């Protein structure tokens, strides 16, 4: 299951000033970048061109070029159309793309958010105000739908061009997509919010892809207070996940951090609290502690 999304952030500051930057993610790998700086889309990977010929891609870049330019001027007008209602600064976000499934099957989307809240979506052959959205949006919606010419080509991109690109991108980037990166791990500790309690931290960094399994163990028994963190991103498109455990001071011994990843095969990373290894690391990373939360 792969989710290909194109992200568009546009900042309207006043009647003159505006900015549009765009990024494109396949699953969770960046493939495309379009800065307001440059008049052309950029590839961030070698295989970002997809399975398309130089001219075949030109029609896209060119159409999109026409779009950026048009999009700005259209909202800039739509603002003028609502004389008192909706004044600057304006923030508009577009998340559009298609999800991938077993077989030829796919499902595309185009979601639009005005000032943070998601308010407009493209569906079938027309834009529509989401259920639970402000009614003033109706007049601008009515104005935009009259354009069969746009509403036509948007169906083209959603119904056809999206999956016919992404079925390409996947078959063209299987090499980078199925790469395996081994995680390094280290232990540490901080005081707990609670008096007399402490917090044990298991750091996991440099692994690819995402799906990983970190747990605090006393032998065969997983510790239920093992709280998984969030996935923090690394520069080189790997990942970072820490897993913390709260302990009664002087119950730190006997515990160990076990890491299960696709990268390693069967050989789990098992770090033992207070092993000659753990001590070697901890002495290798000592400091003054200002300023520590």
């Amino acid at each position, epitope marked *: 299951n792969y989710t290909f999304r194109c992200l568009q952030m546009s900042s309207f500051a006043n009647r003159s000033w505006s900015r549009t930057d765009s990024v494109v993610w396949l699953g969770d790998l960046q493939t495309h970048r379009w800065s307001n700086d440059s008049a052309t889309i950029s590839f961030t990977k070698p295989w970002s061109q997809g399975k398309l010929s130089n001219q075949q891609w030109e029609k896209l870049q060119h159409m999109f070029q026409v779009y950026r330019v048009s999009f700005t001027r259209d909202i800039q*007008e*739509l603002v003028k*159309m609502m004389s008192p209602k909706e004044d600057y600064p304006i923030e508009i976000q577009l998340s559009a793309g298609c999800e991938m499934y077993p077989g030829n099957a796919s499902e595309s989307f185009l979601h639009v958010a005005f000032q943070g809240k998601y308010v407009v979506r493209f569906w079938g052959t027309s834009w529509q105000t989401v259920p639970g959205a402000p009614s003033w949006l109706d007049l601008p919606i009515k*104005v935009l739908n009259a354009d069969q*010419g746009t509403s036509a080509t948007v169906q083209m991109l959603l119904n056809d061009t999206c999956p016919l690109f992404v079925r390409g991108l996947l078959e063209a980037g299987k090499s980078d997509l199925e790469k395996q990166e081994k995680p390094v791990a280290w232990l540490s500790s901080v005081p707990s919010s609670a008096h007399g309690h402490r917090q044990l931290v298991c750091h996991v960094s440099g692994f690819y892809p995402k799906p990983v399994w970190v747990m605090w163990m006393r032998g065969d028994q997983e510790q239920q207070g093992t709280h998984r963190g969030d996935f923090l991103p690394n520069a080189d498109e790997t990942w970072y996940l820490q897993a913390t455990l709260d302990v009664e001071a002087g119950e730190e011994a006997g515990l160990a951090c076990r890491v299960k990843h696709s990268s390693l095969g069967g050989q789990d990373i098992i770090l033992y609290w207070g092993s000659l290894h753990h001590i070697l690391d901890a002495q290798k990373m000592v400091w003054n502690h200002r300023h520590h939360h």
Partner: T-cell receptor
Amino acid sequence: AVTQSPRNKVAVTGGKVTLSCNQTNNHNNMYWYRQDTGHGLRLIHYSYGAGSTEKGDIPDGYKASRPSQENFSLILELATPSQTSVYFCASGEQFFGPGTRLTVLE
Amino acid sequence: TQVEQSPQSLVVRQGENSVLQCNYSVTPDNHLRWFKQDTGKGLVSLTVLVDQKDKTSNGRYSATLDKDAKHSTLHITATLLDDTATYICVVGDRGSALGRLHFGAGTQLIVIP
């Protein structure tokens, strides 16, 4: 169609000049243009609906006012010689007025 | 200057064919419309061109559009005296409300009897 008036006027540098524009065709947005030899029409001011106006390509020296949906007006507070043109009031797919000949003199 | 017309002025003989050219550089090109302006009078629509390769006819008027060469021609088939007028070519960048029209300087057509 579009019923603009006066169909013809002359005024001196500095006089107040207003150009009425009427239409029963029922169009939301409507426009003020001006024609000069070897140029083709140029947008001055333009409206989207009642009680609302916006600046076009060449808005300097002029103003606009929308009271009704049916009416429109292009306003010269201080007139100038260089504002000697013909004035067309469009309505919109876009249907145009018969034109107004304004010679502004020294 | 977005939309240039050739020739400047043109002269044809009563009841003979005449060709008119419009050559834009407007993006986007939703549509191109041709207008006939009698002297003193306003602008009357003649016909509208929409598709990438389009071709229409109306009375003796018959025009064709190539959106990929951003170029149009307007033909009059056997010109009348009632035809001496200026022929303005306009291009519309959007097919909605939020679009503006680009006007040519027009061609002056003179039909000699």
